[PDB]
Ligand binder design. Structure first.
Ligand SMILES: CCCCCCCC/C=C/CCCCCCCC(=O)O[C@@H](COC(=O)CCCCCCCCCCCCCCC)COP(=O)([O-])OCC[N+](C)(C)C
Ligand SMILES: CCCCCCCC/C=C/CCCCCCCC(=O)O[C@@H](COC(=O)CCCCCCCCCCCCCCC)COP(=O)([O-])OCC[N+](C)(C)C
Ligand SMILES: CCCCCCCC/C=C/CCCCCCCC(=O)O[C@@H](COC(=O)CCCCCCCCCCCCCCC)COP(=O)([O-])OCC[N+](C)(C)C
Ligand SMILES: CCCCCCCC/C=C\CCCCCCCC(=O)O[C@@H](COC(=O)CCCCCCCCCCCCCCC)COP(=O)([O-])OCC[N+](C)(C)C
Ligand SMILES: CCCCCCCC/C=C\CCCCCCCC(=O)O[C@@H](COC(=O)CCCCCCCCCCCCCCC)COP(=O)([O-])OCC[N+](C)(C)C
Ligand SMILES: CCCCCCCC/C=C\CCCCCCCC(=O)O[C@@H](COC(=O)CCCCCCCCCCCCCCC)COP(=O)([O-])OCC[N+](C)(C)C
Ligand SMILES: [Cl-]
Ligand SMILES: [Cl-]
Ligand SMILES: [Cl-]
Ligand SMILES: [Cl-]
Ligand SMILES: [K+]
Ligand SMILES: [K+]
Lengths: 861, 861
């Protein structure tokens, strides 16, 4: 658990200081000037400072523990950005391994050719030595990670003594080091090297070789689970290492340009002052002409100086072979820090199953779950690029991919500050979103100036990887590590949904379904899944009827189990379990306390209870008063009834019930639905069949809108209903008007209905009313104003509508029927249940429905 | 209301056939070969066929009436794509006007220099004549648009007779048309021109000049409000005009390549067979050497042939000066068709206030609301480009902008097919989304090959115009981005949150705050808004205690009032109003029914009942049994108490009530917040002060921990406290272990605690208890096992903890103390209140808190 120095600053300084510090800093002052190379260093420092502020803005957005480089970006921002940043950054480190070990092998090859050892040609010995040192770094990565955390301060004190040896060796004018270039600090060599030469390169061709010397700044953010306090450790160490390394780069460029000439023959001259005919700032007796190129379209056939030999810092240095062999400390550290950092990002990326096929590079073998397949993939990508045994073609690829990664980071923090992402509050003092936009545009434009077709390929790939993660299914076991953003999104969307204008008032029918346990009664789940499918809100209520000692402990586990079952099938429904001693006071909990904000259930849809006369006659009072508790909260009451019941508890008629309970989700809609618009203030009675008719399962549904009308004028009433049907855009005009209602209600069925309520001539479980009978009357069966004195017409109309249902709606899928409402108290519950059961005697799957008559058709605008 | 021919096909063939048909088709066979130019025409036909299928997918998305070109795109797709397509297409037609009139002016200048009329140099006469003909087309556009609808069939029959004149003039071998090239159809000239020459150009530099001759296909879709049946007229006419014009281009290229030589001196030769030393296919006695260029880096110094003269189709034609000078019919139509079409799209774009400043270019003067400021802007953008009086530099700009517009159309229909947009069902037979994606990628890649920095500028501008309209104040032509998209996103994110893995299980505390009316008790709003902000979920509850006949009618008005009252302040809380007979059952309504899915309240926070000794002891049973009902559902319980009141019933004592009822939103913190960790399995007791301490108000507040224990090891248990505090992310060393609990409970304070319960000494506000003790024994004060026998040490512990709180916590902002829990049934409710009120007598704003010991510290991972 390191501090900020040993955990961030030392790692970032060892990662930044790499190949170009000793190998290629003098060549950059050779090609460009001192002024242009300083402009190059300031440009790279601006890019990496803006990216350091964006990384510090990410690192201070909470989310400390269980960190890394992929983790912070993927948790603060979305998966769509973080997956592409992880892939591009992993590939950038994988290709950078090759660059660092190619620089190491080139240094070893030139030190070998300074002796007599030479096996094959020069460009093949780099492949041999680079292959040998990449199979040796992989073994250190997969077998020796323990000593590496102690070795890094030793590598840093080798490297800083190398830098100090070069810087104090420049001040010592040696006459033996003349003819290799390197006179003392002179004004003539300062003025001569002020201004570009560009002997085969250009600006933005020299810059693309420098820019790998500025990368490696995310080596402090690559350990957030090994830091003490990351929100203080990362912005100090990263933004201080950038300053220190950039200042050392500026000092090396200015010091190399002011003491070494651009070309030099390695032959000493006896003169101390040359003959006065050259004036090329070499007044120490060296004539360095006939070493510059003749034409302006070729490289020089010289061998020393700033342009030619690539190793002049070992000449300038006070002690060459051992202190300025900190190149072996600079390259081999950085390559190693890029060999352990690409499979880390790629294994954290393959544990969230964002991209489909790459998920086999996450199985970490061993005790630490080190990704060995990721190490072998990184070894393959590095060894493919090693065989291009030339630094000046590998380095622009590294610059392209790291510039793409840094532009993605800056654009992602800009876009998250712009969009007001819900979990995005970057408490960092020097973060600005417009600076991040400027840095992203700068990296993208420079990436196109360096090479336009490589940049176009990279941007097309990143755009494809963004659009793929945007439009892909949000189901479970897909990227489930990123979960804390979904909570804040679901909270802020509901917080915006609760606040709208007070004069819009869209209807959007919500519904709670008294279904019991959701694995039981599946037909009502499929039928209230038919309508309110990405249209409204569905809700499954379940009242547990345990009276004494309710098992409050196992309610949460059973709720989570039932919700996981309901999510494992196709359903857009939530689940609410309450616990009471009966059904009515149990559903009183969910009538007036369900939902949050505007996601409250509007209508109540229940099933019909067929077993009301078979046994337990008490609970009928719990069932009708429920409806009388549903009509008082201005809800909508929907009753569903099949030919047989829905309560499934598991042979011939049992299989008939089990097959009728799943008659919707698997079958089709061959056969017409038909509504019966009888009440004018129904409302929802027409919204329901239009919603259930526009579905995949329902195509062959001719909505036969029936309406009881005036008997005198049967001509224009159907036109006045047809314009309302055109207003509701249900798009059918098969309207049939009836006039034979309440005429002669089939007295042989009147004798069936009168013998139905014959044991209930005194009302059901009304012990107060029954004991209040005896204080006025002795014969009990004389109160009939409640029962049949004032409501002959209601019962006659109910049985007449039953006969019309049997006649006109013989073959049908559903029947949307307006539900008869009677005022409570004056009408008993048993009489009302008798009317509802005689209205829907042995029909097809009818649907009694009565709305709140507040306002409809505000839906669909 | 035209048919498909006269309204789509004639318009598209007049817009497509333009400059390059007669001026620059033969030069394209001059630079490239016949094979490469045929490849060029087939590639342009592929791009325009894919874009025509995308336009026909857009045009068949319903939406017949109220047409246009911006309207169809902006209404089928979104405004973000439609605004950028409208802007880029308007700019492309505005710059295309200049290309067509520059071709016209160049033709008139060459016809003038064939005579003796020559005012200034050649490149200035084009500027003069082009300026004169653009100030004349503008007057026709703003004053003579009626005759143009009749003139177009006359223009087309001029143009087709020009094409037929050229094609029948090729078959007539004239010996006078020799020496300007043009032998008959020969096999030697066909074999000589099969293969590129590229005398100063490249492939994709010749394609970029051809591709403006394939554009113009959106001239049929640009009039959809003047069309009879657009879903038949637009694909038929567009996809037939593309085939006709491409076949004519292929025919012109093949015919011109096989009868004219590339270079020719305009001098006749007396010979009929050349001397047998050349063999360069001119065996008709013409030595056409000494016009081929010497080096491979210059143009030929010749004057005729395919490479040089640009007007060789007037030489091949049978009647030159009148029929094949139907270039005046080809250019001046197309320019006019691009002068009436850029202000049209730019005025339809500026009537939707999408982009801010451009809204003044929409005020249409006159009767038809013709956009005159748009006409003047198009005139200015054209006239700035006519001053570059060269066709071969104007034409790649037109190619880049039209390729950008076609790529935007193709990508937009692919993105609308991919995302399943709500109103996107393109009933067209030959639409495929992957063909559109291929066309978009092809147009983008070709746009980058032609000129990479112009393409990069165009893509940056189009991306900026997309991201601007994506994130804006919503002012769309409809309100589907206000109520529909918000509901869909909120419901699908609630369903996404409710379905996750069962083993993640973060805590993320949600709170049921009992405030009553939210304009009352604002201190509890500010306190449980301090924590559970940007972390959890706040759910303010209000019970209505209306017993007799509760109102349910206008309670929706009260809920919509108080929700807007919450949202007008900076609060993120939801509101739930229930109605019961007392507060306990009303809170029990919200304990098991509030929230949906995973957004249910886990904790319950109430305010302490200050006036419980004054009157109405019968409701204290409703307060304590609420707490015992809160602990039954495994809820955490937080109780807030102030020394003064909490609610606001609206002189100077009321002032100190009101000024301390709002003591959190306008004050700050400079000092300490102290906790009293006294229970092992609390967990939330430390989670709450860490959450309230990380706030902008509570920045200067140090957390001080108090803890009981033993006396032998007081430096040992604070280490065990410090490691779990480091596990709880506070890490404060102000943990002072005390050893004064249940030791010596300060006998002078026992008198007030004894006299407080003195009217309750065996009167615990229960009728059943008094009824049991009136017949069990004869004295009242009998069952005192709960009163003093079994719970003496508990009451002495509370009465000692109060004095410890007064000693060590006299001046503090917040006091977070653990709450004593007793077992119900045995311990009286009045005894429970006697324990709770003694703990918080004259204290700062204390906070009693007891967790549910389920799982904490899974928060922050
Ligand atoms: C090659 C090298 C490239 C380098 C330069 C690259 C150019 C890019 C340079 C961009 C820097 C310039 C923009 C800064 C100005 C902001 C003004 C301001 O301060 O007010 C406010 C903004 O409100 C505004 O007024 C925004 C005005 C800027 C819109 C211009 C976007 C540029 C699109 C570029 C299109 C491509 C450009 C090219 C197209 C041809 C401040 O912001 P805020 O709303 O208060 O939010 C802060 C919230 N903080 C509180 C989160 C916590
Ligand atoms: C001036 C303006 C000019 C503008 C010009 C613009 C032109 C610029 C051009 C930009 C091109 C960008 C478009 C490509 C995006 C395609 C996405 C896609 O098709 O995926 C889909 C299927 O496809 C698959 O299943 C493929 C498997 C995954 C591959 C990811 C896509 C290819 C990435 C290659 C990277 C190589 C990686 C190499 C390194 C590893 C997603 O499948 P789904 O889940 O079923 O989605 C259904 C959505 N629904 C549920 C809502 C119905
Ligand atoms: C590897 C991959 C590398 C990736 C590298 C990335 C590639 C680089 C991509 C870079 C794309 C850059 C996108 C910048 C977005 C613009 C800023 C914006 O959104 O509006 C801002 C200001 O807006 C204004 O006030 C001015 C309105 C126009 C500005 C945009 C058009 C400029 C370009 C057209 C020029 C003329 C063209 C016409 C002539 C043809 C919004 O301001 P706000 O105060 O914040 O509003 C708050 C409301 N909100 C919170 C809801 C938001
Ligand atoms: C350079 C210039 C030249 C460029 C030219 C070459 C460029 C290459 C461009 C495009 C290449 C063409 C892609 C062909 C894919 C067809 C397979 C298929 O039919 O899937 C289908 C079958 O659904 C399935 O059964 C699953 C099959 C996997 C989906 C394949 C997606 C490939 C993503 C490739 C990502 C490429 C990213 C490119 C990044 C560079 C799924 O979709 P659908 O059912 O058909 O939906 C129809 C809906 N509709 C009826 C409304 C329309
Ligand atoms: C590698 C993948 C193959 C893809 C095949 C695709 C089919 C390609 C078909 C054919 C391939 C192209 C053949 C001709 C090459 C263009 C020659 C040319 O005109 O010079 C060009 C550059 O000069 C170069 O450097 C060209 C080097 C090759 C780049 C083109 C391949 C990239 C294809 C896309 C890679 C991304 C793939 C995206 C995802 C699919 C132009 O130079 P300029 O300075 O810009 O012009 C100045 C204009 N001015 C004079 C008016 C100022
Ligand atoms: C040279 C490269 C060739 C291609 C160039 C590309 C041409 C560009 C032209 C047209 C293409 C348009 C680009 C985005 C495509 C839309 C699809 C999408 O992302 O859906 C997402 C939308 O996304 C957004 O809302 C913001 C856009 C973010 C884009 C960031 C890309 C970063 C890659 C940088 C690399 C590119 C660098 C370009 C060069 C500088 C999600 O869909 P949604 O849920 O419906 O969102 C609704 C949000 N709302 C409710 C607030 C409205
Ligand atoms: Cl380096
Ligand atoms: Cl990096
Ligand atoms: Cl043209
Ligand atoms: Cl067009
Ligand atoms: K580096
Ligand atoms: K054209």
């Amino acid at each position: 658990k390191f501090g900020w120095i040993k955990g961030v600053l030392v790692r970032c300084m060892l990662n930044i200081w790499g190949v170009m510090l000793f190998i290629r800093m003098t060549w950059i002052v050779g090609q460009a000037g001192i002024a242009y190379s300083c402009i190059i260093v300031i440009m790279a420092t601006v890019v990496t400072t803006i990216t350091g502020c964006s990384t510090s803005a990410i690192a201070t957005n909470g989310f400390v523990r269980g960190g890394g480089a992929y983790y912070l970006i993927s948790r603060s921002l979305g998966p769509e950005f973080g997956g592409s940043i992880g892939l591009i950054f992993a590939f950038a480190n994988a290709v950078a391994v090759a660059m660092y070990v190619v620089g190491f092998a080139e240094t070893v090859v030139e030190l070998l050719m300074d002796s007599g050892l030479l096996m094959i040609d020069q460009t093949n010995d780099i492949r041999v030595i680079g292959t040998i040192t990449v199979i040796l770094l992989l073994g250190i990565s997969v077998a020796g990670m323990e000593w590496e955390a102690k070795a890094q301060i030793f590598l840093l004190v080798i490297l800083i003594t190398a830098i100090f040896n070069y810087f104090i060796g420049s001040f010592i004018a040696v006459d033996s080091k003349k003819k290799f270039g390197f006179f003392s600090y002179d004004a003539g060599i300062l003025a001569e090297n002020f201004g570009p030469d560009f002997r085969g390169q250009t600006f933005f061709s020299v810059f693309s070789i420098f820019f790998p010397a500025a990368t490696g700044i995310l080596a402090g953010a690559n350990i957030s689970g090994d830091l003490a306090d990351p929100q203080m450790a990362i912005p100090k160490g990263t933004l201080l290492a950038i300053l220190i390394t950039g200042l050392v780069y500026v000092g090396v460029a200015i010091s190399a340009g002011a003491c070494i000439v651009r070309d030099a023959t390695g032959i000493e001259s006896n003169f101390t002052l040359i003959s006065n005919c050259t004036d090329a700032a070499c007044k120490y007796g060296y004539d360095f002409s006939s070493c510059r190129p003749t034409v302006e379209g070729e490289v020089s056939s010289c061998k020393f100086g700033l342009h030619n030999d690539f190793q002049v810092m070992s000449v300038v240095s006070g002690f060459s072979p051992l202190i300025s062999a900190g190149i072996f400390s600079a390259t081999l550290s950085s390559a190693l820090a890029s060999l352990v950092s690409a499979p880390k990002v790629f294994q954290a990326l393959c544990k969230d199953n964002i991209y489909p096929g790459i998920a086999i590079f996450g199985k970490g073998y061993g005790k630490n779950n080190e990704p060995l397949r990721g190490y072998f993939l990184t070894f393959g990508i590095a060894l493919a690029f090693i065989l291009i045994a030339e630094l000046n073609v590998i380095a622009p690829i590294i610059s392209n991919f790291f510039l793409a990664s840094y532009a993605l980071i800056n654009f992602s923090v800009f876009h998250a500050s712009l969009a007001n992402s819900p979990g995005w509050r970057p408490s960092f003092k020097y973060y600005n979103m417009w600076a991040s936009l400027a840095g992203a545009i700068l990296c993208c434009v420079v990436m196109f100036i360096i090479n336009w077709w490589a940049a176009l390929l990279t941007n097309v790939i990143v755009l494809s990887l963004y659009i793929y993660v945007s439009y892909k299914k949000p189901d479970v076991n897909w990227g489930s590590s990123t979960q804390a953003l979904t909570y804040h999104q679901a909270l802020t969307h509901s917080l915006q949904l609760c606040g709208v204008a007070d004069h819009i008032k869209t209807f959007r029918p919500q519904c709670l379904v008294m279904t019991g346990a959701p694995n039981s009664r599946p037909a009502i789940l499929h039928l209230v899944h038919a309508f309110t499918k990405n249209v409204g809100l569905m809700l499954c209520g379940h009242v547990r009827i345990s009276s004494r000692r309710p098992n409050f402990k196992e309610l949460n586990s059973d709720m989570l189990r039932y919700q996981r079952w309901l999510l494992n099938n196709n359903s857009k429904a939530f689940y609410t379990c309450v616990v009471a001693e009966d059904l009515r006071q149990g559903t009183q909990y969910m009538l007036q306390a369900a939902g949050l904000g505007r996601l409250r259930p509007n209508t109540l849809v229940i099933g019909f209870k067929n077993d009301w006369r078979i046994g337990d006659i008490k609970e009928v009072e719990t069932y009708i008063n429920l409806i009388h508790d549903a009509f008082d909260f201005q809800y909508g009451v929907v009753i569903l009834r099949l030919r047989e019941g829905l309560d499934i508890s598991h042979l011939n008629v049992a299989d008939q019930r089990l097959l009728d309970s799943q008659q919707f989700q698997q079958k089709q809609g061959k056969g017409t639905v038909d509504v019966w618009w009888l009440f004018d203030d129904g409302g929802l009675t027409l919204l329901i069949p239009y919603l259930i008719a526009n579905k995949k399962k329902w195509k062959d549904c001719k909505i036969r809108v029936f309406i009881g009308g005036k008997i005198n004028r049967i001509d224009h009433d159907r036109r006045a209903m047809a314009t309302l049907l055109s207003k509701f855009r249900i798009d059918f005009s098969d309207i049939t008007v009836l006039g034979d209602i309440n005429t002669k209600p089939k007295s042989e069925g009147l004798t069936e209905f009168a013998e139905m309520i014959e044991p209930y001539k005194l009302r059901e479980d009304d012990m107060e009313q029954e004991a209040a009978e005896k204080l006025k009357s002795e014969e009990p069966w004389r109160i009939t104003d409640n029962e049949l004195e004032l409501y002959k017409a209601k019962g006659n109309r109910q049985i007449r509508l039953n006969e019309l249902l049997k006649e006109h709606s013989s073959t049908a899928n559903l029947i949307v029927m307006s539900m008869p409402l009677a005022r409570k108290g004056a009408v008993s519950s048993a009489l009302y249940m008798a009317w509802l059961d005689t209205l829907s005697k042995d029909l097809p799957p009818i649907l009694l429905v009565r709305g709140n008559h507040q306002s409809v058709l505000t839906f669909y605008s």
